[PDB]
Ligand binder design. Sequence first.
Ligand SMILES: CNC(=O)[C@H](Cc1ccc2ccccc2c1)N1CCC(=O)N(Cc2cnc3ccccc3c2)[C@@H](CC(C)C)C1=O
Ligand SMILES: [Mg+2]
Length: 181
Amino acid sequence: GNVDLVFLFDGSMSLQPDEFQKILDFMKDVMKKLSNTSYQFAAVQFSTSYKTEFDFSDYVKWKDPDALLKHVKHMLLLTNTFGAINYVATEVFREELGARPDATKVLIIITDGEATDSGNIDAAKDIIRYIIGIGKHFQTKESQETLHKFASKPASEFVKILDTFEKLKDLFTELQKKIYV
Ligand SMILES: CNC(=O)[C@H](Cc1ccc2ccccc2c1)N1CCC(=O)N(Cc2cnc3ccccc3c2)[C@@H](CC(C)C)C1=O
Ligand SMILES: [Mg+2]
């Protein structure tokens, strides 16, 4: 069947330029692996505020990850994850922007920190949510457990903690045959 998948990617001030580029390259690798499938993609950068970098209609038009992410500018602010998830649920999964009514809705969140805001994500209850937390901010179990509230359940299946940004490519290499769900 059809999957509408959104990447919600951290553009916070804690990321070095090299680290931000590794997030971009990962999204590109995933999209390239799934080209010519029934997946459709959108990407949203989040920091203090939220920007749709490309929507589903854009993807269908260009089908070129490198082209679609060429103009991305690193926001360099905070990490308002609650607001970001709500923004995706209400502003991105919209028929007008190319979302398909019949499709399974999936959100992949990539982040290097705890949320600096609060709230709820009731609006996103129907979206399958997979979270990748990267780096030293998730060294402790307590910080890791803050991500469980954004993820689908059970957390053991929907939260992945990576110690370095190099692990994005390593895990892609290791597990790429599993991506075509
Ligand atoms: C059955 N497939 C999986 O479990 C893979 C495993 C995987 C493979 C590559 C990875 C690369 C970096 C970090 C983590 C990775 C994890 N898996 C995890 C589970 C998941 O929910 N999704 C999201 C997803 C993707 N497509 C779906 C289609 C239908 C229903 C639910 C769906 C859920 C993806 C996430 C991955 C691309 C980071 C995934 O392939
Ligand atoms: Mg950060």
